[PDB]
Design a binder for this molecule. Structure first.
Ligand SMILES: C[N+](C)(C)[C@@H](Cc1cnc[nH]1)C(=O)O
Ligand SMILES: [Cl-]
Ligand SMILES: [Cl-]
Ligand SMILES: [Mg+2]
Ligand SMILES: [Mg+2]
Ligand code: NA
Length: 430
């Protein structure tokens, strides 16, 4: 007897006995930040039931909901077990599955406090989840409230954009200041600036090595027909700047997960003030403190020859096979020989394969699993790259979050590689 609105409860003991079953899909309907590990109700152990997939209940208003589910490989013949902080949070999702041809749907009532509270019940979390912050954390920070995973006394919220102050002036997080990505990377090479330039730029924007910097950007629907589509890919830009700042030596860098969209979806107030900078006189550390995060072309060439190492191409497929360059300022088309392809998404200004529709990072197990199928694994020194390094930086950041011990960005990318006509390249379908 199928019942659309009254959902069978699954007990703790029954769920424990099913933890290894390939026919069971355990679905966490909490926010992706809680799933990653954030202790959003004060639970002592954060994260998810081991083996659970992420399907935030917020996504029920997405017209593509069923396609998300199918793309996650959750199928009608699976036994679906839903949980949240409360069973009541699962009710609408359970009904949505049942309305869409899933007849085996249960609700687990005792994730919190029973599962989270007992250390024999397996949980998992994104190892460095505290670098990828929810909007509630940022709001607590700017409010001076006590927040978890923070013991500094100095912070700055930084709104990234590429040559587009309107992205900030049209609406930003209260108190935040804007940073043009041109402040930290050069329009000549599209590589990070020299250490002396980085020092000066960081100081002028009010940033010391011991400042907690919270970076985010605004997605404004990049259109490849505009002169500068990157002016609209603000949150990729934010993660690119996070890379450069962490390389430079800012000890504590955070990224707002999903960027500006997450702030407004949470319903917080926004500001249009043009906030003046408060400069600081001394960065306070030698730049770069973390040079290993950045790989230039001679090291990249060595990595292509080493068994220990690989370059990871985070470009679109039409770029990879040489149909297009990806960019209106790159004429050469083709790919670096010997790199492992890890398709970014549709084009140079979209990261669909690394993100959810709401711009939060894609469920990290899915990224991990796809990467492993190509031999992109943490025991290697990996250098992520793309055309000029923005998408490479976002892939790199995803691997950093997983705790991977040797990940870098090959900054120069296809731009630098193809600018030397002596460098070999491939084209066409492999
Ligand atoms: C390095 N700039 C800022 C010129 C890039 C940034 C970028 C966005 N997606 C890939 N790269 C551009 O806007 O094409
Ligand atoms: Cl973006
Ligand atoms: Cl390439
Ligand atoms: Mg897990
Ligand atoms: Mg570069
Ligand atoms: Na290699």
């Amino acid at each position: 007897h199928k019942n659309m609105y009254d959902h069978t409860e699954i007990t703790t003991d029954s769920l424990l006995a099913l933890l290894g079953s390939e026919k069971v899909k355990i679905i966490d309907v909490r926010s992706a930040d809680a799933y990653n590990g954030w202790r959003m109700r004060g639970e002592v152990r954060g994260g998810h039931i081991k083996g659970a997939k992420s399907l935030p209940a917020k996504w029920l208003t997405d017209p593509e909901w069923l396609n998300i589910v199918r793309f996650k490989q959750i199928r009608p013949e699976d036994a679906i077990v839903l949980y949240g902080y409360t069973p009541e949070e699962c009710e609408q999702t359970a009904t949505r599955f049942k309305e869409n041809g899933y007849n085996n749907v249960s609700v687990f009532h005792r994730f919190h406090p029973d599962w989270t509270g007992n250390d024999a019940f397996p949980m998992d979390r994104l190892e460095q989840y505290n670098r990828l912050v929810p909007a509630e954390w940022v709001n607590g920070l700017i409010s001076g409230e006590e927040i978890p995973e923070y013991d500094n006394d100095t912070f700055i919220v930084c709104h990234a954009h590429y040559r587009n102050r309107d992205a900030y002036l049209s609406g930003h997080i209260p108190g935040a200041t804007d940073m043009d990505t041109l402040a930290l990377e050069s329009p000549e090479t599209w590589n990070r600036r020299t250490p002396e330039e980085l020092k000066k730029a960081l100081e002028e924007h009010g940033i010391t090595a011991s400042t907690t910097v919270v970076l985010y950007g605004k997605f404004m629907h990049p259109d490849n027909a505009d002169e500068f589509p990157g002016s609209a890919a603000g949150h990729i830009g934010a993660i690119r700047l996070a890379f450069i700042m962490m390389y430079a030596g800012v000890e504590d860098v955070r990224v707002l997960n999903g960027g500006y969209q997450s702030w407004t979806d949470a319903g917080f107030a926004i500001s249009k003030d043009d906030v003046p900078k408060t400069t600081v006189p001394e960065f306070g550390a030698p730049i770069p403190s973390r040079p290993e995060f950045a790989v230039d072309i001679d090291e990249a060439k060595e990595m292509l020859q080493s068994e220990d190492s690989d370059l990871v191409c985070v470009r679109s497929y039409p770029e990879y096979i040489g149909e297009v360059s990806g960019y209106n300022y790159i004429k050469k088309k083709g790919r670096i020989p010997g790199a492992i392809f890890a398709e970014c998404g549709s084009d140079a200004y979209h990261m669909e394969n690394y993100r959810n529709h709401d711009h939060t990072t894609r469920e990290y197990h899915e990224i991990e699993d796809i990467w492993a199928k190509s031999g992109i694994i943490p025991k290697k020194h990996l250098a992520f790259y793309c055309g000029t390094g923005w998408r490479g930086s976002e892939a790199w950041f995803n691997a950093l979050l997983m705790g991977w011990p040797r990940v870098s960005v090959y900054d120069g990318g296809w731009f630098e590689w193809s600018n030397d006509p002596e460098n070999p390249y491939e084209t066409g379908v492999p």
